[PDB]
Paper text:
The results showed that both CrmE10 and AlinE4 belong to the SGNH-hydrolase superfamily and the bacterial lipolytic enzyme GDSL family. Among these four residues, Ser and His serve as catalytic residues, and Ser, Gly, and Asn serve as oxyanion hole residues.
According to sequence alignment, the catalytic triad of CrmE10 consisted of Ser29, Asp178, and His181, and it was composed of Ser13, Asp162, and His165 in AlnE4. In mutants AlinE4-S13A, AlinE4-D162A, and AlinE4-H165A, catalytic activities toward p-NP esters were almost abolished.
Residue numbers in the entry: 0 to 188
Write the structure that this text describes.
């Protein structure tokens, strides 16, 4: 092909940063290769930061855009998972993401929003509220939405890293049954 690469900003959290993966295995790195098959030579700016909340993304979006030598031609926004993991207000996550999209829209940078979904642990009220923020934002900011970014791995535990292992309430009971003897023995009589 002739010409310089198309510049895409991948603005996100651990899922963009490539947490737990080797060089070149991250989603942005593999997406850059895959777009060659669409006839596109892209340079994808990896602005993934592991553990970023929507508030942390809002805090840095201007800095990240002002740091670019070449203005992004598309910004892919993937945040809210860490808000979920901290049980933070869905309303505040919506407000934070709105601030990020407003800054992109001010600069006339097209937006692709990666939809996040809440697991059942947070309960149905929280899950419905959180899940609804992404279509709301996509409509409000005229953004393209991928409704469920992690849909392709949702039923594929073989495609998910083993990392954090937080027991359920029943799992805690299991651990107590296994370890109470050792605790009772360790405590002086």
């Amino acid at each position: 092909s002739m010409g310089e690469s198309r510049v895409i900003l991948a603005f996100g959290d651990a899922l963009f940063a490539g947490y737990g993966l080797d060089k070149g295995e991250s989603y942005p790195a593999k997406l850059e290769t895959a777009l060659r098959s669409h006839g596109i030579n892209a340079r994808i700016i990896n602005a993934g930061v592991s553990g970023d909340t929507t508030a942390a993304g809002l805090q840095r979006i201007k800095f990240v855009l002002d740091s670019q030598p070449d203005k992004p031609e598309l910004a892919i926004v993937e945040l809210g998972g860490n808000d979920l993991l901290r049980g933070l207000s869905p309303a505040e996550a919506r407000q934070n993401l709105s601030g990020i999209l407003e800054e992109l829209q001010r600069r006339k940078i097209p937006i692709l929003l990666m939809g996040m979904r809440a697991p059942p642990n947070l309960g149905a009220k929280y899950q419905r509220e959180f899940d609804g923020i992404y279509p709301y934002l996509a409509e409000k900011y005229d953004a393209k939405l991928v409704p469920f970014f992690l849909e392709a791995v949702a039923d594929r535990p073989d495609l998910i890293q083993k990392d954090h292992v937080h027991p359920t309430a029943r799992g805690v009971e299991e651990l107590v049954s296994a370890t109470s003897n050792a605790v009772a023995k360790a405590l002086p009589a």
